[PDB]
């Protein structure tokens, strides 16, 4: 209730003071009161809502005054509908605008805070002391009232506006009145336009020639009438003067009238004009009026042709003034005609060349307001129904611009509206069903729809609108006559002749111009041209030349010389002496001037654009340049700064905003809910600032605004009232703030091309080039810069007289030369001038900075020669390092250019030389720790070999690191990426380097409260600087995936525009404090890879614009050896007399792996991904295999090393025949650097060492190894696991290598393979085998990543405060999304989530983590150390490791690329299973059951045996028989034979042996039958017919037994892989089987007709009975699998066959009774509870009815069946089995239960119809045939069960 | 498709009541409305060539031309209008709502030019026989009076196209066409046969 009362702690408070409202409502307020009075004075303590609740009393006081306050609250808003049914106008108003009114209704004045909402052309109400004299129109103009209206308060807001309403239009109607009671006597318009409104003398003025004319059409008259028009108009055109801007204005309505009223003059002077019926004059619009009437809005007639109207008088001042056209007459005329017939419009053109200045004009000329509306956008039209309350009980007007263009509610609801709208309108209803409300209609009210050229022309509006509406094809304004007429208007002597030559200036130009798409020369357009020549003239422009002078002055400007000379004469050929001479002395002399300070050559075109930059400066409010910042862009921008502040005397007060850093809100503001708060945002402090103290102070400071961005609507359209031209805030909290004159926006970009010419055009607009900046200019500010070094240490002395020696090598330097040839250069992103000479010139200053202290203490001679080798080795670097070391190579041949060193062959080049402190310096020979790494820290990360370069790299990174530069490498993860960066960032921890992670999701704010977390702040003046949270450390953040961030909706580069804010900007304009924030010690650098690449971002060139860069790429043979061996080096130290494998065991490695990745490409797989840290990891695995033996001998050395290889490399790899490959050219390689061992053994064995056993060094016999699992298996697999697969060779060695994994840390892997084909069942193995938690998710699409956060956290406690063993698994069918992704994707790469556990979750680890340090007997409360115990701890137990299949949508890199995660992850493709272990399974299956039955000898014939098993018993050829089976069952990609699971005939097979029990039961139970004839039949001997059948039965299936098992073979294929397999593959078998799977020797029966073979007909019968459709074969088998499949058979039914089916099945049984219970599924559970028969319900498909998890639990629960049966899943026995009976054939089934899932179908097709017509026909005559044939069926099985 | 008199008389039993009018001249040209409108929709049957686009023509604007009329038929019945210029806004305005191009214009134009005057017992167009004096007679109720006596002067072959005042050729060219659509639209079927 407080909530009500909130409304009423402003309301009810208001007007339970205000006595004023309704005495009814007051009392109301007050029996609030008589409660409320505790509601707010009781709650003047206790005042929110809860508090409200618990007051003194509550009991009564919100009962009694919650009665009367939602009385009240109710009856208020009805309260103001009554005033807003008392007051029409009032619907224009919001209710809360009421409420202000009301409360304020006395005050009047207050009232009229509304008063647009409440009105037409009305500027202001003219009074005074509480009394109206006048009003003042929005055009200047004053009606004076003729009463004074009192604003007593008694009188309400409703009368009082009432009151004016007559007053208005009756001071309106006399004064009228009075004034043509003068002119109607020819007394001068000039005396009563003073005393009053233009308008309605315009009428009179109309009038007065329209009746004169009449006796030049009597035909009496003809020039009296036309020279006295133009006597009248030559007066006027005197008159027509600036001394009154508004009346000028009057002016130039009346003569455009006047001409009009000339012109038709003119002809029906100079021509035979059959008098008032020649349309000459006849369809002019005229006018007539009188005084006579009883209604005073009749006072004057308007018409043309026959058609006759009656102005409407509404008070509109003088708001138009459009130039009138023939056509646009006409065009009027004919929206008359639609007035007529009451049908609303359909308006076809573009608004500028017409359309809503033309349908605005013409409302006008009628005299009554329309509201013109903006359709095309996101408005709530229930507001529009409100305001058409007001409006049709009004009369008012309404017309759509853009109508059609609405969604389908809003356009449906004003359809079934409007409907009404046009219909009452016809029907003349009085009140109309507006909103089902019967809303009061004023008959005046008009719909106007208008369209620019529509959609293709289409008539968009629906019929059901359409019919009552009128076409009005718009073709074209009358340019060159519209231009003309206002020339003449304009006082422009020359008038025709501009015209006729404007037309064509553009005309021509138009015509043979390029494609300046961002310009066009439309009717604005001119229009634009003249309103700038308007002035030129009042600047003494000299005619023609004024015109020629603005077309200087505009367009050109924003076209290029793509036109240059094209547009000089298409313009010129129309007038050649043309132009006037700009003269802006003192404004270039401050411009200039302000060039010669900055330092810029002051070029010709610089000067010329900042010249007309400056025309736009003082014409324009707002410019955009098209450009490049720091080259011109910027540097323009820079000078108008200072000449401006100079030329105005004005300092220019700057506001630059990078738009899209900041949000609108940021800038602008927002609120607080809690004390009710509106926040102040940046721009609109200022603005505010700008009143307060900028001019408040500086009152005519010059004051700007920039906007640094692209464009695109969203950021754009924001800034429209100020930016536009209008240059007044005003917000919609009501904070108008007039913004000064001097106030100017500047708008940079380099594109512009995004949105609509309609609005691009409205600002000033320079086609800028680069070229403005001479390399010369470029060169001085160059030199200038030395003046701005350096450091506080350095005073410049020296550094100014070695400027001065080094000024001489700018003097036409080879670079001029070389610059060129650096551009020559192969490079990824774009290269340009100012950042090679930035970069050049930044390290060559803090090469001096070391000048300073080492050379400044020694000569200038030490300064001089070391300067000279260390600079061009610094330019050199600068133009090249950047790329490849190749085309560096060829980039450094450059040197022949230089005169002096020049010599492209030097050796030991400049860069191979390296500078020292003492002037001395020396090639940089290799020191590349020789004896080094020996033991122990061989696995310690930074232990990463440095190398010649990598210190290179380092000599000039330290000079860059002294330059406070952020290099941004551009290489690979795995090529040196981490190596080198460590081994840079190890060798100063003066820098505080930071790891920022660059994840698709990361975001700027995750930066920010990293800085918060280690910054704080400084402020040596009030300035803002950003310090670490401790000093002298320099804080070097840094930057990892710089090109792997996502991008917006326009791909800009959001994160590098903060980044760049950062950077760029150096710092932030705080927005929570109002302040800009620069930085201490905070440095960073970058990295990438090549934006090439898939993912990669297109990087922003203005970022790199200053930015350093560095190649990183592959190491080579010798220096993987000089690298990688040392490696190797330290693993040799533990085994002396072995140790000798030195060098050719690397080298071996070094080669194998040049070849191994030229040998393996992506073009092969995609992840066929390599890098030398396989090399390491050879090193890693091979160190620790040491650490475990006793000898390391060179057999013993190339077993475990050539085993491991194979792991690190083949493991990764698909192809197995390429797999076959590597191992010869593994064993090659090692045959040529180690062969005098057993390769044999070792490389053609997949041998395993010993895991079960300690290692030692020793192999284990796989088969022994086996031995070992076949016992250990059997107790991890506590009868748990529940999956029967046969450990192959493969399977164990599967298990040695998870297993290793397993022990080792940082347990980071990708398995690719197949689902659930022990892939998974591996891994749940080895956790019962090591003993770990492990990490498994459940997910149903309910869940998101905050679940996931949850997880995280609950992980990361779990490992370190929990202290748990764990490992973490991750199931690709979970991949809930990208961010998800994202939180594990930093996890793994710093091994950490930043701040994941900040806040609270940081605080709480404080506390438990001293808690655990208590009890640890730690002393860390330092919370840096402790939480890096925190995290170390989480390392050794988290390891995380993801399997994935490849049968979706996830990138086909089997990851979603992440090259940070390819340089980490272990990877091991799994793939598919082999057909030689396949088939031992299936031995060890047949040798559980007595498939050897003697009768059967080697039984298949038909066919296929080619390359088997020496077939010789059944368990030989059934096997045998299988695999070939299965092998060519399936073979040629219809659905996949390159991928596919084996399980479809597994367990074919598995039934196979139920039948090889069943079937011989079958049979056996028949021999004791027809044993059982014979007993007495033996000796019965009468018959001998009898005797001798059962004989021969026993002779038939002595050989049929054998016969059917090759039958029986081909049966298994329906279940096998039949059921989804097409053509393609199914028919790779078909019927090829029963062709193939012979040659094994028993007969195949051609006949393969399972359907009856395999089961008693009866049973389909019974379901043919229950509506089966026999139709298809397999159609109809579905039956059977309803009644046998194990593998749900999916009832797929949009044919709905199964619910007739399961109906007719269900017949007298009840739907579902044994198991019962619910678990996690009531919604099925209790839909089924009944008794008998039933399947997952009738089209219910599993998305409704079941969870995701079922899965799982179908399969098996514990948490539903017990085990004191055993049993897992639930008794829902066959009847009512509950198989989903589902009509959805997409159904949620993941990549694993694809696999594991029977599908089945249901639908008929083609390839029957064929025989149902034969059907038909057949049977409509030989029915009688079946007949006898089926009944003889019958009877025979009679007759078989009589035998 | 039905034609032209079937459009014309069926058009006056739809429009039975507007010769109620005692304007007997105004029927008179009620019936001329009618012809004029059957012989347009009959042009734009044959768009884009006898008429450049399926402009909706309807009854509606044939009763807002007997308003626009009525506008000038106060005195229209006599030489105080100048019903020439009445026919050209008839045309532009009441027909002419969203019509495009000048051709069709001038199309149009043609027709009433060989359709509408304001007086009444003239020929009109003798080709449909029209010379008559129907004056105070109904467009419905005394349609046989003048106008349904008006025989069959419509060729099988031709509507003919010069009551439309357009060329045989033209009917011919489409002819041509007619073969290449009909014979490239089997050639699909004719894929198998």
């Known amino acids: 209730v407080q909530f009500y009362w909130l409304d009423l702690y402003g309301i009810l408070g208001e007007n339970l003071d205000i006595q004023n409202f309704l005495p009814l409502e007051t009392s109301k307020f007050k029996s609030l ?170 009428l009179s003025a109309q009038v007065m020639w329209t009746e004169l004319v009449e006796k030049c059409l009597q035909t009496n008259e003809f020039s009296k009438y036309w020279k006295e028009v133009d006597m009248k108009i030559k007066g006027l055109l005197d008159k027509l003067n600036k001394s009154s801007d508004n009346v000028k204005k009057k002016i130039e309505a009346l003569l455009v009238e006047y001409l009009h009223f000339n012109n038709v003059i003119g002809q029906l002077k100079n021509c035979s004009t059959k008098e008032e019926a020649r349309l000459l004059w006849a369809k002019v619009q005229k006018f007539y009026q009188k005084n006579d009437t009883l209604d005073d809005l009749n006072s004057v007639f308007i018409s043309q042709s026959g058609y006759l109207l009656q102005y409407k008088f509404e008070y509109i ?91 389908e509610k809003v356009l449906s609801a004003v359809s079934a509206n409007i409907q009404q709208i046009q219909n009452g309108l016809q029907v003349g209803k009085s009140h109309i069903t507006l909103l089902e409300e019967e809303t009061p209609l004023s008959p005046h009210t008009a719909v106007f729809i208008t369209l620019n050229p529509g959609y293709n022309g289409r008539s968009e509006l629906p019929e059901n609108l359409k019919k009552s509406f009128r076409e009005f094809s718009m073709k074209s304004p009358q340019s060159g006559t519209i231009a003309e007429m206002i020339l003449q208007i304009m006082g422009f002597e020359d008038s025709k002749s501009l015209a006729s030559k404007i037309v064509h200036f553009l005309e021509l130009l138009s015509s043979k111009c390029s494609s300046m798409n961002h310009y066009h020369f439309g009717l604005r357009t001119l229009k634009g041209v003249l309103r700038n020549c308007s002035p030129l003239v009042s600047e003494f422009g000299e005619g023609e030349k004024t015109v020629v002078e603005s077309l200087k002055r505009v367009i050109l400007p924003s076209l290029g010389d793509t036109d240059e000379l094209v547009f000089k004469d298409e313009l010129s050929k129309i007038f050649d002496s043309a132009g006037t001479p700009l003269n802006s002395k003192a404004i270039v002399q401050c411009l200039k001037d302000a060039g010669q300070r900055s330092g810029f050559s002051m070029s010709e075109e610089f000067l010329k654009k900042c010249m007309q930059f400056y025309y736009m400066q003082k014409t324009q409010q707002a410019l955009i340049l098209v450009g490049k910042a720091g080259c011109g862009k910027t540097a323009t921008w820079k000078t108008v700064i200072d000449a401006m502040a100079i030329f105005d005397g004005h300092a220019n007060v700057v506001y630059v905003i990078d738009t899209k850093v900041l949000t609108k809100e940021s800038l602008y503001g927002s609120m607080l809910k809690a004390t009710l708060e509106w926040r102040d945002g940046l721009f609109t402090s200022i603005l505010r600032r700008v009143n307060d103290d900028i001019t408040g102070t500086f009152k005519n400071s010059r004051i700007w605004v920039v906007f640094d961005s692209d464009l695109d609507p969203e950021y754009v359209e924001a800034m429209n009232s100020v930016l536009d031209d209008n240059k007044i805030l005003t917000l919609p909290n009501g904070e108008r703030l007039p913004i000064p004159p001097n106030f100017r926006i500047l708008f940079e970009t380099d594109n512009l091309d995004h949105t609509t010419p309609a609005t691009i055009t409205r600002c000033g607009l320079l086609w800028f080039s680069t070229d403005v900046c001479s390399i010369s200019s470029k060169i001085d500010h160059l030199l200038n810069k030395s003046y701005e070094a350096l450091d506080n240490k350095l005073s410049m002395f020296e550094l100014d007289k070695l400027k001065d020696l080094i000024s001489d090598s700018f003097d036409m330097a080879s670079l001029t030369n070389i610059f060129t040839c650096s551009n020559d250069l192969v490079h990824i992103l774009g290269v340009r001038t100012f950042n090679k000479l930035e970069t050049a010139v930044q390290l060559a200053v803090h090469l001096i900075s070391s000048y300073r202290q080492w050379f400044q203490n020694l000569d200038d001679k030490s300064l001089k020669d070391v300067i000279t080798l260390l600079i061009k080795r610094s330019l050199l670097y600068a133009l090249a390092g950047d790329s490849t070391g190749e085309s560096q190579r060829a980039f450094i041949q450059t040197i022949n250019t230089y005169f002096g060193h020049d010599s492209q062959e030097l050796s030991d080049y400049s860069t191979i030389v390296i500078a020292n402190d003492k002037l001395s310096f020396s090639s940089f020979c290799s020191e590349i720790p020789s004896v080094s790494l020996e033991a122990h820290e061989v696995m310690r990360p930074d232990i990463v070999i440095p190398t010649i370069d990598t210190i290179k790299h380092e000599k000039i990174f330290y000079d860059l690191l002294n330059s406070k530069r952020g290099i941004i490498l551009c290489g690979p993860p795995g090529s040196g990426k981490t190596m080198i960066m460590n081994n840079a960032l190890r060798n100063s921890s003066l820098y505080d380097v930071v790891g920022i992670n660059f994840s698709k999701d990361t975001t700027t704010e995750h930066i920010l409260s990293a800085l918060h977390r280690h910054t704080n702040y400084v402020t040596t003046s009030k300035g803002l600087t950003l310090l670490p949270k401790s000093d002298i450390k320099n804080l070097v953040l840094f930057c990892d995936e710089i090109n792997l961030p996502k991008l917006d909706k326009y791909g800009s580069q959001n994160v590098v525009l903060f980044l760049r804010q950062l950077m760029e900007k150096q ?29 990669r971002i297109p990087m922003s060139e203005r970022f790199t614009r200053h930015a350093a860069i560095l190649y990183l790429g592959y190491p080579s043979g010798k220096s993987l050896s000089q690298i990688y061996e040392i490696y190797y080096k330290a693993i040799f130290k533990l085994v002396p007399e072995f140790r000798s494998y030195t060098e050719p065991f690397a080298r071996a490695s070094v080669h194998l792996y040049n070849e191994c990745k030229a040998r393996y490409s992506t073009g092969l797989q995609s992840h066929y991904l390599f890098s030398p840290r396989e090399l390491t990891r050879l090193v890693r695995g091979v160190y620790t295999a040491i650490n475990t033996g006793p000898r390391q001998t060179l057999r013993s050395l190339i077993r475990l090393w050539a085993y491991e290889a194979w792991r690190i490399f083949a493991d990764r790899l698909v192809g197995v025949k390429e797999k076959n490959s590597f191992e010869q050219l593994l064993y090659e390689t090692v045959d040529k650097y180690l062969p005098n061992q057993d390769l044999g053994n070792i490389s053609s064995t997949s041998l395993l060492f010993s895991g079960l056993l300690s290692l030692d060094f020793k192999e284990v016999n796989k088969t022994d190894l086996v031995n070992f699992i076949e016992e250990r298996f059997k107790t991890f697999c506590d009868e748990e696991l529940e999956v029967p697969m046969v450990i192959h060779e493969s399977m164990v060695d599967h298990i040695l290598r998870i297993d290793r994994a397993l022990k080792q840390v940082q347990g980071h892997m990708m398995l690719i393979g197949a689902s659930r084909t022990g892939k998974t069942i591996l891994t749940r193995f080895v956790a019962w085998l090591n003993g770990l938690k492990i990490v498994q998710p459940k997910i149903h699409r309910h869940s998101n990543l905050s679940d996931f956060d949850m997880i995280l956290k609950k992980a990361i406690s779990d490992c370190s405060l929990k ?65 890096d115990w925190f995290v170390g701890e989480i390392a050794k137990n988290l390891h995380v490791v993801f399997t994935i299949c490849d049968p979706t949508n996830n990138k086909s890199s089997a990851m979603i690329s992440s090259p940070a995660l390819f340089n980490r992850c272990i990877i091991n493709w799994m793939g598919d299973w082999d057909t030689k272990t396949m088939s031992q399974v299936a031995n060890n299956m047949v040798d559980v059951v007595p498939m050897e039955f003697t009768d059967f000898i080697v039984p298949e014939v038909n066919k296929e045996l080619v390359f088997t098993e020496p077939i010789q ?150 379901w043919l009975e229950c509506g089966l459709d026999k139709n298809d074969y397999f159609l109809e088998n579905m039956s059977i699998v309803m009644n046998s499949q194990d593998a749900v058979p999916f009832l797929l039914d949009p044919s709905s066959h199964m619910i007739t089916v399961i109906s007719n099945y269900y017949g007298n049984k009840t739907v579902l009774l044994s198991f019962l219970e619910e678990g996690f599924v009531k919604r099925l559970e209790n839909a089924v509870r009944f008794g008998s028969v039933v399947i997952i319900q009738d089209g219910e498909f599993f998305d409704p009815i079941i969870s995701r998890l079922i899965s799982r639990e179908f399969n098996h629960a514990g948490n539903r069946v017990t085990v004191e049966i055993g049993d897992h899943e639930v008794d829902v026995s066959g009847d009512f089995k509950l198989f989903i009976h589902s009509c959805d054939p997409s159904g949620d089934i993941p990549i694993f239960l694809r696999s594991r899932v029977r599908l089945v179908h249901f639908v008929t097709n083609k390839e029957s119809i064929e025989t149902r017509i034969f059907d038909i026909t057949l049977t409509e005559e030989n029915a009688e045939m079946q007949r006898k044939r089926e009944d003889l069926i019958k009877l025979n099985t009679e007759y078989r069960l009589k035998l | 498709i039905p034609g032209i008199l079937d459009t014309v008389k069926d058009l006056w039993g739809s429009q039975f009541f507007t010769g109620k009018i005692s304007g007997v001249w105004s029927v008179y040209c009620t019936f001329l409305l009618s012809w004029f409108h059957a012989l347009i929709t009959a042009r734009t049957r044959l768009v884009p060539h006898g008429f450049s686009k399926k402009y909706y023509f309807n009854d509606c604007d044939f009763q807002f031309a007997s308003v626009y009329l009525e506008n000038v038929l106060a005195t229209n019945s006599t030489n105080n209008i100048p019903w020439a210029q009445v026919r050209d806004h008839i045309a532009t305005i009441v027909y002419g709502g969203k019509i495009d191009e000048e051709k069709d214009l001038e199309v149009v134009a043609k027709l009433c030019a060989h359709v509408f005057c304001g007086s009444d017992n003239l020929q009109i167009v003798p080709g449909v026989r029209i010379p008559q004096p129907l004056l105070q007679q109904s467009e419905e109720e005394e349609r046989a009076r003048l106008t349904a006596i008006l025989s069959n002067t419509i060729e099988p072959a031709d509507s003919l196209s010069s009551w439309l005042q357009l060329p045989r050729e033209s009917i011919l060219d489409y002819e041509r066409l007619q073969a290449k659509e009909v014979a490239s639209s089997t050639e699909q079927l004719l894929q198998e046969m």
């Open chain 1, 33 to 202: 009161t008589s409660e409320y009075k505790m509601i707010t004075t009781r709650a003047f303590q206790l005042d929110t809502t809860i508090e409200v609740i618990h007051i003194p009393n509550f009991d009564t006081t919100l009962k009694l005054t919650i009665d009367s306050l939602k009385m009240i609250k109710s009856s208020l808003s009805t309260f103001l509908e009554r005033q807003r049914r008392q007051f029409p106008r009032f619907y224009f108003l919001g209710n809360d605008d009421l409420l202000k009114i009301i409360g304020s209704g006395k005050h009047h004045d207050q009232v009229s805070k509304f008063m647009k909402k409440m009105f037409g052309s009305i500027e202001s109400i003219i009074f005074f002391e509480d009394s109206i004299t006048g009003v003042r129109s929005v055009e200047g103009e004053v009606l004076n009232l003729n009463e004074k209206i009192e604003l007593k308060d008694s009188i309400q807001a409703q009368e009082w506006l009432n009151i004016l309403d007559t007053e208005i239009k009756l001071s309106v109607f006399t004064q009228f009145r009075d004034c043509l009671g003068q002119l109607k006597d020819g007394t001068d318009i000039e005396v009563v336009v003073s005393k009053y409104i233009f308008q309605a003398i315009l």
């Open chain 1, 317 to 407: 001042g003088i708001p138009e003034r459009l130039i009138y056209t023939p056509l646009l007459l006409v065009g009027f005329a004919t929206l008359t005609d639609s007035l007529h017939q009451k049908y609303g419009g359909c308006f076809f053109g573009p608004a500028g060349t017409g359309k809503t200045e033309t349908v605005k004009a013409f409302g006008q000329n009628l005299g009554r307001v329309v509201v013109v509306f903006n359709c095309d956008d996101s408005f709530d039209y229930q507001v529009l129904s409100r305001l058409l309350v007001g409006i049709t009980q009004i009369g008012a007007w309404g017309c759509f611009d853009e109508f059609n263009r609405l969604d």
């Open chain 1, 1067 to 1095: 710092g932030f304009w705080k927005t929570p404090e109002n302040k800009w924030v620069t930085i201490e010690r905070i440095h960073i650098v970058g990295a990438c890879n090549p934006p090439t690449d898939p993912g």
């Open chain 1, 1363 to 1427: 202290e748990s063993r764990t490992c973490l698994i991750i199931d690709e069918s979970n991949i809930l999304e990208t961010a998800f992704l994202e939180r594990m994707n930093t996890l793994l790469a710093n091994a950490d989530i930043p701040d994941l556990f900040q806040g609270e979750e940081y605080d709480k680890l404080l506390n438990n983590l001293r808690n655990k340090t208590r009890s640890l007997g730690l002393l860390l409360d330092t919370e840096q150390e402790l939480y």
């Open chain 1, 1513 to 1662: 018993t059944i368990r030989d050829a059934v096997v045998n028989i299988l695999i070939h089976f299965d092998r060519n069952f399936y073979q040629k990609m219809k659905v996949g034979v390159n991928p596919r699971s084996p399980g479809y005939f597994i367990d074919g097979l598995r039934a196979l042996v139920k039948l090889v029990t069943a079937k011989y039961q079958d049979l056996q139970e028949n021999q004791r039958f027809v044993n059982v004839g014979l007993e007495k039949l033996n000796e019965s001997v009468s018959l001998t017919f009898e005797k001798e059948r059962w004989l021969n039965t026993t002779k038939q299936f002595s050989k049929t037994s054998q016969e059917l098992i090759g039958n029986c073979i081909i049966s298994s294929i329906y279940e096998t892989y039949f059921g989804h397999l097409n053509e393609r593959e199914r028919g790779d078998m078909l019927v090829i089987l029963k062709r193939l799977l012979g040659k094994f020797a028993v007969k195949y029966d051609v006949n393969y007709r399972f359907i009856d073979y395999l089961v008693t007909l009866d049973e389909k019968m019974k």
